Design a protein around this nucleic acid. Sequence first.
DNA 1: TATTGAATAAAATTGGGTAAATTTGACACTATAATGGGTTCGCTCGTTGTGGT
RNA 2: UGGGAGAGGUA
Lengths: 49, 207
Amino acid sequence: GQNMRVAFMPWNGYNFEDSILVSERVVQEDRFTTIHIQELACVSRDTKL
Amino acid sequence: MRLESVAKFHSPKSPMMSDSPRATASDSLSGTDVMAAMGMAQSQAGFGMAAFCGKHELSQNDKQKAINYLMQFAHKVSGKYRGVAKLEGNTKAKVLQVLATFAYADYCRSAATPGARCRDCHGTGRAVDIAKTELWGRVVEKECGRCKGVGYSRMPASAAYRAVTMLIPNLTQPTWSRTVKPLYDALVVQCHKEESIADNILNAVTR
DNA sequence: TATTGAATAAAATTGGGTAAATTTGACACTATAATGGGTTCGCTCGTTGTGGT
RNA sequence: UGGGAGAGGUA
Ligand SMILES: [Zn+2]
């Protein structure tokens, strides 16, 4: 993972019960952006018709 | 034209038996948007949709809807038949109810009615003439002589007459044929008219 | 001046039958000698019927 | 289309 600057304080109920508030710089700098490669298949079969 | 595909679509999910299924496109239509188009075409042309679903025994609750619409039509149209136009309120409502129910059962009657299929042809109305096959060599067909081509025993209109003369006793058969039975035939012609205009509006919607 | 009930004739229906097609189900393919089978566990706890000194 | 196993996971 990544090393995140973390402050321990309640912030307006946005970290209420094991919730996490994240800055928009973590989304801008693309720190937790993951790549998800996905394979689709297509089979050409011998139909009796 | 357009309507009978929806009667195919009112069934449950049938199992397929073929090779590679699932075209996965919008080639014809889906199975839910046809019902959505039936919903869009219900504010106008609901009579024919209710009558069609009641006739083909899919959603067997709109039989009462079709009988109620036919009763409303008979209440609107009863002012041109000399036998019914002189009766009093609840009695005229009950005779309109009983001849509406019998007219709708006459419209509903096809070769799938229990006890109505032809004896010989088994509903097809098409038997094979053995002499023309013996002289021609090939296989031929002819009209089923018992059913006379229609494939089912038709509904006699005198059933409604017997069911109304338990309520109007002084109404004999000649005046029944003279000033009551045209209203009955007007009801079944109105059923066919409403089914045709509902098929037309369905084809106008899903075009 | 109509309209309607008794009578009515023609057509549709219906129950029964019936001679003739036609479908159904079953068979049918043959000799050296040969002669008794492969499954199952530490997988706890309550209930209930069945069998036993 | 859509059925059954087995394995792992989340609260
Ligand atoms: Zn027939």
